[PDB]
């Protein structure tokens, strides 16, 4: 998981 | 304003010790880029930026004022590049992703300005 999205390279996702 | 105190140099002499650490920093690309380029609030999508960390910075600005010469001490530069890592860490509340890339680029750099802070200060 992960990813570049969101904040830095944070993007948590989850549901 | 010009010499602080200790030995201050020419921009370039502190640059010579200076920038290889933050070049050590940008070897850890997957660890510098969040910062190589400005901490984006909008890229970022964190409203709360300069609402903790007061003083952003970022290897952008950081290699930049480096670089073209916008110092005179390297203390200066390192209070930077720090302040920087640093915003990752009290921004990030630690237990996120940056936290790791911000980890190594304090750690390496610690390792780098070793060798500059002691023959740059």
Same mark, same amino acid.
């Given at each position: ?15 | 304003?010009?010499?602080?105190? *200790? *030995? ?17 920093? #940008?070897? /850890? ?7 190589? /380029?400005?901490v984006?609030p /909008?890229?970022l999508?964190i409203p709360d930026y300069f609402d903790i960390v007061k003083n952003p910075?970022? +290897?952008?600005?950081? *290699? ?5 010469? /916008? #110092?005179?001490?390297? %203390? ?5 590049? %720090?302040?920087?890592? $640093?915003n990752? %860490?009290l921004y $990030?509340? *630690?237990?996120?992703?940056? #936290? ?19 023959? +740059?200060?």
């Amino acid at each position: 998981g992960g990813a570049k999205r969101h904040r830095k390279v944070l993007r948590d996702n989850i549901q | 304003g010009s010499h602080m105190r *200790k *030995k201050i140099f020419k921009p370039e002499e502190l640059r010579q010790a200076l920038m290889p650490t933050l070049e050590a920093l #940008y070897r /850890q690309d997957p660890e510098s880029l969040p910062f190589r /380029q400005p901490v984006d609030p /909008q890229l970022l999508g964190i409203p709360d930026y300069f609402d903790i960390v007061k003083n952003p910075m970022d +290897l952008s600005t950081i *290699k930049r004022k480096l670089d073209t010469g /916008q #110092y005179q001490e390297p %203390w200066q530069y390192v209070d930077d590049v %720090w302040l920087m890592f $640093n915003n990752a %860490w009290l921004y $990030n509340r *630690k237990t996120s992703r940056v #936290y790791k890339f911000c980890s190594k680029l304090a750690e390496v750099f610690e390792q780098e300005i070793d060798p500059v802070m002691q023959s +740059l200060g």
